[PDB]
């Protein structure tokens, strides 16, 4: 039975802790994969943490990070949300140095890009087998969300980028049913730049807040209709939500074009709330440390900088990193609306710490009807490790 | 299908061993969480050990206990009753430095309190997702049972405390259906003090024997009707059942008020038997060592000190600690009545042993139709460990 | 749906390897329980290895065997047949320093005896919970099969011994339905001695070949009708099948009384074949080394020493030990008859090897329509271990 | 419900990565079996990696390879495709130093040959139990595919060899239903030589490309009709596909007889494509290093050397080894045709590397509608290990 994700996103005063896996502390002695980009997606029955494995284990010579991001040993695997990315509970998903995964109601669909940078291959899995394939259309590191993809009425949608990391690239929407690609569209977005989209179903369409790694501190935003018509631009709110970024007071927002004169970036998320936005961001405007979620009044549709609520979840004394979006299925939450939820990756080791290795642990938050007090559910590992 | 827990508690001559997990001995070489407060609750199909993890593993630097009780790395997880709290069979439940869990017949409901002491948050999970939330109402370490909660006809009930550990605090009953709080009541109990309740269903109402950490050596007792009307007071029997406590002969019992002039305490349990009580208690009146269960004639309703049966389960040469209550569902035991069962936590390491770490193993006993001989199913680990 | 075990035992020319767990070799680096007495019983859907754990792990200080056989840390757990007794795939069964387990078609029933030698308690589990209890009736180490028990038409039967290890003791049959004891009978057997019975269903009754630890080199044999009437005596064949034992040529068989003037013994098995017997035995008549299965013509009902077939399975250069019986359910094998199967425990470490510890691995053989060549599927661990 | 494998093999432009287990890198610290011959077979619901375990673990004294290939500690076990052959997720299949496994739609059938070389025994398992047996018919190391077997309409077929490794031997087809052998035929093939067949269902018959270890660089090929009539010979294409082998230009192909004057060999695969062939082969013509798949036009039925497509999957700088065939069931892929898929074993350690041990990791590729770029998904372990 196909999941209907046609409802509106729940309006939410605050965010409550869902889980915390404790990957790295546990991996001081347990058998834990060295991972990065640990996103969450939910099936009608259970939510799971997916993650790229570097194919090695914490506290072992193979975690020696000289090993490439985009290596043949990089696999997409998963476990249940809140469990560490450990070998003995891991489920194999796909070979991928960049990934997206989402469940439609019957089965899991996953998309793992691997292979050489000039002609990468993306295998689409459905229910545990390859079902279809996308090739590099631009010969420059084919990539995708690193976050849950979005299934509405049996059809699953996702965004992909082919091209340079720091100048104009090419961006596409892709549409599958039961693991077969059944539609796709280029995204006309000049000067603009889109990477690592964080999407969620909302009102029968698909909203993503993604990353601009070229010019913009604000995040690109698109809304994909079921016929892969779309609208694209930037999260309107007059507050930079990327990293690095300039201070809030030196930033004029825009619904149209990038703002800020910085390159680089980091993956983030945002949730539409009527016309408001819940937008996540690192606390540091410089590095990937600390994490907070601001609610800007009218920020989805205005250059507003009127802030209703702010809730710290990782304090500025602790490393954070990637963040992404997903919803709770109605069939799990009880609600008549789609509960917004996010995860926050917390990076330990290189480049900011003196270890041979790099990995991350995560924490997942879900949208509730109440204000939740500020806190810091930071990673917690005692660095360095035995090496 | 909802579990009916409306039956009476089985009248039981004695207690038979259900399980013994051997957590700490096993964790000398295996991959075992460092845990505390390892209670048991049963679903129509299986009983499980829940436990707070300190997020680290035995024989590892992160077990270094300087780490706070109420830390962001403290998670509620579980395994099947009798299995050790090991990583590779663990199921994630919630982020919580204080927890309660119970199954209603369809799904598991869990409640994990985490966050800062001045405004703690309790996320209610249902079937593996956050469904509702309680906030600190008194700004002083929001807490709960550390024992199975109680589901009668689909609705699950539990007790919570907001306030000081050593003077008057505030106590509430809470009532959920399918993860949504649908009712709650304050508990008018002045001079009295309630913490870490050990509840069980009995006669269509909910009976808890809880801990008074302020004035009383005897245990508070409440009986919650389905409309959250209640009665509250103390276990009548003229025998102190807390720790520390005075000797039996210097103690006049009371159904109304605390007795003994000691502060402190430890979590314990008791089971109504018509008018008698099966009351558990440490053997030492000073420290948490050894464990025994006395049956006092008319002790539920009298100041009686008439003891019918006594059964040692952990001898005074061995560490014990927390204890709690739960029943076997009819759908599991075969019986027309609710089998009383308890667990006993057995604490090793700090503060009484010279290790860096502290954890505990457990043993579960269930009510039977026969006298069972005294014995000691103590923890057994050979301290200290490699460190 | 209840298993009918009313069929006849399959007539079988030979025995084929079912499994080999490799427990001890694997436990040189893996996380493997230190075990003894690893028997097998089958459910309509899967066969499992049960085993007493000493509660510790190979290559760890807690395996230090000074630890008692009959300790409070001794638990009955299980895994699927052929898998090692490892922590992360183990299922908890009961607290027991002596055990029997068997499946009736709906659920697993297990029986774990634990507690003090003067008044031991046997908890009967059904579907994962205590359901009933037997107490010491003779105050001298209550014990049982260490082998699969036998379920015919929903009712499960097993044999127990209360008394001395080396002179007359007391022996009982016990009969459960759904975990409730519903019948029992004393076994009038003077001068005779019964321990550690190896039973199997055959022709709607229950046949056990058990061990006499007092006087007899030949094995006691009983046949339990559904009304717990019985016949008891000795396996007729004129060949000693216990260990230690005298040579075949100095042994006159008997259907009635023990023969041989030795005390001691070891657990073994035998399978009726019309009037023949398949009888297992160590190769060494002195120690527990090597294993073979002889088919004696008319040996169930005669003092015969006419040997049709012999098949070595563990050679005299390798340690063996315990052996037991069980059948394959029709619902698994396809056959219209009950396939005889046995397991052979293979003991490493103390007393015969210079280690601190003692454990064993196993191998399971099933009855087939062909002669199978002699071989040795011995344990294989390289002793001693890191200690 | 029985799987229909009666469809034609999908015509496929290229091969996409299915999985990569990372066994050996992971086994630098994790608990990983030392394995060889890690093939894949699929059930209607999931594909699994089967493998011979040497019964020991990486980084342990028991991996010390002096241990025989054909030892009593050699077991067939399995895990889900893409997961490493680790102890805690392993499922026991059979005792076997040579194996084949395949699922018919209802259950798994496995065939494990073990025992002495002069009279080896092959136990057939069905749904987890021994159901039937084949004995050595030629007294010279009874062996089989090391690759998925083939189930068409409930009946499963497989090829076996009894005889010398380097001169004429004997070869048989075998046909089971529900674990009972129900048919078999000798394969009249003089001068020819057949070992380690790699089969797949195609057009309602069974096609195997196998290994000739006597005279031929080209691979034997057979096509087994459901009545075990057959045709046998050699893959026609004028290109040697074994290892070692001569260069392509010095090789005249044949549909009839072996070509090349070399002994030895290694297991490989091939897939019929109408009249073309997808044939796999090591890159090195000398050693087992690198892996590629050529599509020869008309190569199934001609001496053609017209090459349409070539796709490297493991580069000549990296060890490869065994390869085998299997299909995706329609009930998994969605397709109206049978998706060709193969796996490639990647051997580390002895004989080519300076370690005490030998094992291998694998990677699985499935047939798709597109050209996939060359790459190398090599094993990746950093040799030697701690030993
Ligand atoms: C496809 C890819 O490699 N994406 C990068 C991505 C970056 O290249 C741009 O978004 C594309 O222009 O950015 C980052 C990043 O910003 O940190 C990552 C995440 C790093 C994973 C990692 C870290 C340490 C060792 C191995 C892998 C990703 O691996
Ligand atoms: C919510 C809380 O922290 N409760 C305490 C509780 C105590 O604070 C009072 O009941 C509230 O007034 O008491 C105890 C206790 O009496 O020992 C505990 C249990 C200790 C868990 C622990 C032990 C060592 C290291 C880390 C955690 C609990 O952690
Ligand atoms: C109930 C019991 O303890 N049975 C013994 C049993 C023996 O006492 C007689 O049968 C009863 O009279 O015999 C044996 C035996 O003959 O070896 C055992 C098995 C030993 C298990 C063990 C070995 C080493 C360390 C810990 C336990 C059993 O543990
Ligand atoms: C049945 C058997 O032993 N087959 C061999 C097989 C070889 O004997 C011929 O095909 C039969 O004539 O060939 C090979 C091979 O060509 O390498 C193997 C695979 C080796 C497994 C292994 C490697 C190292 C240590 C232990 C086992 C197989 O083990
Ligand atoms: Ca940027
Ligand atoms: Ca007190
Ligand atoms: Ca004897
Ligand atoms: Ca050859």
């Amino acid at each position: 039975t196909y999941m209907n994700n046609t409802e509106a996103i729940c309006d939410a005063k605050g965010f409550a802790p869902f889980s915390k896996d404790n990957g790295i502390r546990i991996g001081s002695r347990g058998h834990i994969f060295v991972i990065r980009e640990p996103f969450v997606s939910c099936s009608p029955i259970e939510c799971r943490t997916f993650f790229l494995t570097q194919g090695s284990l914490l506290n072992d010579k193979h975690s020696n990070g000289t090993v490439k991001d985009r290596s043949p040993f990089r696999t997409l695997m998963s476990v249940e949300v809140g469990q560490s990315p450990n070998v003995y509970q891991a489920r194999f998903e796909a070979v991928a140095w960049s990934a997206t995964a989402c469940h439609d109601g019957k089965k899991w669909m996953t998309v793992g890009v691997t292979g050489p940078d000039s002609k990468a291959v993306a295998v689409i899995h459905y229910g545990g087998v390859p079902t279809d394939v996308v090739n590099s259309w631009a010969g420059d590191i084919l990539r995708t969300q690193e976050s849950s993809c979005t299934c509405i009425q049996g059809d699953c949608y996702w965004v992909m980028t082919d091209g340079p990391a720091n100048r104009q690239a090419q961006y596409r929407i892709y549409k599958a049913n039961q693991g077969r690609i059944i539609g796709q569209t280029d995204i006309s977005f000049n000067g603009g730049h889109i990477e690592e989209c964080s999407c969620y179903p909302n009102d029968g369409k698909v909203e993503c807040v993604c990353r601009d790694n070229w010019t913009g501190t604000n995040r690109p935003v698109l809304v994909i209709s079921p016929d892969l018509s779309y609208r694209v631009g930037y999260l309107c709110a007059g507050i930079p939500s990327d990293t690095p970024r300039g201070e809030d007071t030196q930033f004029t927002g825009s619904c149209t074009s990038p703002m800020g004169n910085q390159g680089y970036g980091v993956k983030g998320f945002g949730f539409r709330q009527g016309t408001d936005v819940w937008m996540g961001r690192t606390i540091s405007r410089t590095s990937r440390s600390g994490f907070e979620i601001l609610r800007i009044k009218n920020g989805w549709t205005q250059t507003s900088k009127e802030q209703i609520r702010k809730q710290v979840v990782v304090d500025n004394l602790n490393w954070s990193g990637y963040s992404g979006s997903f919803t709770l299925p109605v069939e799990l939450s009880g609600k008549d609306c789609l509960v917004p939820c996010f995860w926050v990756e917390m990076i330990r080791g290189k480049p900011e710490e003196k270890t041979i290795w790099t990995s991350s642990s995560s924490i997942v938050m879900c949208g509730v009807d109440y204000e939740v007090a500020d806190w810091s559910w930071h990673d917690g590992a005692i660095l360095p490790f035995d090496i």
Side-chain angles (χ1 to χ4, degrees), chain A:
Chain A
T1 296
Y2 284 137
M3 212 152 55
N4 305 328
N5 275 146
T6 53
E7 298 85 353
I9 287 293
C10 298
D11 188 81
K13 271 208 198 84
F15 290 88
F18 188 1
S19 79
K20 176 150 188 299
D21 60 89
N22 276 327
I24 316 209
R25 302 168 44 96
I26 297 173
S28 186
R29 152 149 286 224
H31 290 156
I32 304 311
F33 271 123
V34 173
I35 62 150
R36 278 292 326 250
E37 315 161 43
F39 68 97
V40 180
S41 177
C42 292
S43 51
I45 294 169
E46 66 173 23
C47 303
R48 302 184 57 91
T49 297
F50 297 79
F51 47 88
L52 291 182
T53 62
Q54 313 190 357
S56 46
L57 305 189
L58 293 173
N59 247 346
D60 186 87
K61 46 173 190 168
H62 293 85
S63 74
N64 184 282
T66 22
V67 170
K68 192 166 68 283
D69 328 358
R70 294 193 292 294
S71 75
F73 315 116
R74 200 99 202 266
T75 52
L76 171 66
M77 315 192 77
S78 71
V79 287
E80 310 196 30
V81 66
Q83 279 169 338
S84 55
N86 63 80
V87 173
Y88 311 134
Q89 288 171 331
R91 168 191 288 181
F92 176 90
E93 302 288 2
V95 184
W97 42 249
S98 179
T100 188
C102 64
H103 192 125
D104 65 8
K106 300 176 186 262
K107 308 198 210 183
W108 280 100
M109 188 204 70
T110 70
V111 185
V113 195
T114 188
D117 294 14
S118 48
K119 275 170 202 180
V121 67
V123 181
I124 290 105
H125 299 249
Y126 194 59
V129 294
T131 59
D132 211 321
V133 152
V134 198
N135 267 313
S136 281
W137 71 77
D140 201 350
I141 314 178
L142 176 61
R143 48 212 189 273
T144 189
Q145 297 176 201
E146 331 295 344
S147 178
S148 174
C149 56
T150 303
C151 283
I152 312 184
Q153 274 155 332
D155 290 354
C156 312
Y157 306 81
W158 67 104
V159 187
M160 290 177 103
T161 298
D162 217 329
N166 61 347
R167 53 202 288 144
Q168 181 72 55
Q170 297 186 0
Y171 332 95
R172 289 186 160 162
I173 315 181
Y174 271 104
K175 176 168 189 223
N177 171 267
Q178 290 183 60
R180 288 280 141 79
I181 296 172
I182 63 175
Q184 60 175 118
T185 46
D186 317 325
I187 293 165
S188 178
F189 200 63
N190 283 313
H193 196 249
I194 303 171
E195 292 194 316
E196 277 162 359
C197 287
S198 294
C199 311
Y200 58 88
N202 197 3
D203 277 321
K205 293 179 179 179
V206 180
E207 325 196 315
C208 309
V209 192
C210 330
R211 158 195 182 171
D212 174 308
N213 210 77
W214 177 9
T215 301
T217 299
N218 46 334
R219 302 206 167 272
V221 153
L222 70 159
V223 182
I224 312 168
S225 299
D227 68 9
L228 311 175
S229 65
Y230 63 91
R231 284 178 187 263
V232 70
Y234 289 87
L235 192 57
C236 291
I239 289 186
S241 57
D242 213 345
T243 297
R245 66 169 179 276
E247 42 187 354
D248 295 337
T249 189
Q250 285 163 348
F251 182 85
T252 304
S254 190
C255 306
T256 276
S257 61
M259 287 286 317
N261 197 53
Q262 285 145 270
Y264 211 47
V266 60
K267 175 189 175 57
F269 75 97
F271 279 102
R272 205 194 103 209
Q273 296 280 252
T275 293
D276 309 349
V277 279
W278 272 109
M279 54 161 60
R281 77 172 183 177
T282 84
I283 301 190
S284 183
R285 304 174 311 213
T286 297
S287 54
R288 311 178 155 182
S289 50
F291 199 87
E292 65 192 11
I293 199 178
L294 304 198
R295 183 172 176 146
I296 309 311
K297 181 159 184 175
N298 292 306
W300 192 281
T301 79
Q302 267 167 219
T303 321
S304 165
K305 39 190 61 195
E306 179 164 21
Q307 162 185 315
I308 316 156
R309 315 188 135 105
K310 154 175 153 151
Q311 177 189 335
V312 187
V313 164
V314 173
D315 64 32
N316 56 45
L317 303 182
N318 285 282
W319 301 118
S320 63
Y322 270 38
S323 295
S325 57
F326 71 92
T327 50
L328 298 180
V330 170
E331 304 93 332
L332 256 186
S333 75
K335 290 190 176 181
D336 51 79
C337 65
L338 298 177
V339 174
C341 291
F342 64 93
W343 52 268
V344 184
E345 172 198 46
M346 297 181 288
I347 306 179
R348 308 303 307 273
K350 305 160 67 138
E352 295 302 320
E353 293 161 285
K354 311 316 268 188
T355 56
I356 62 162
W357 57 268
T358 302
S359 201
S360 65
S361 83
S362 82
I363 163 182
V364 189
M365 314 285 298
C366 280
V368 295
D369 291 342
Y370 313 81
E371 275 196 44
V372 169
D374 285 3
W375 223 39
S376 174
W377 287 276
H378 52 259
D379 170 77
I382 296 170
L383 296 213
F385 279 3
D386 302 6
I387 290 154

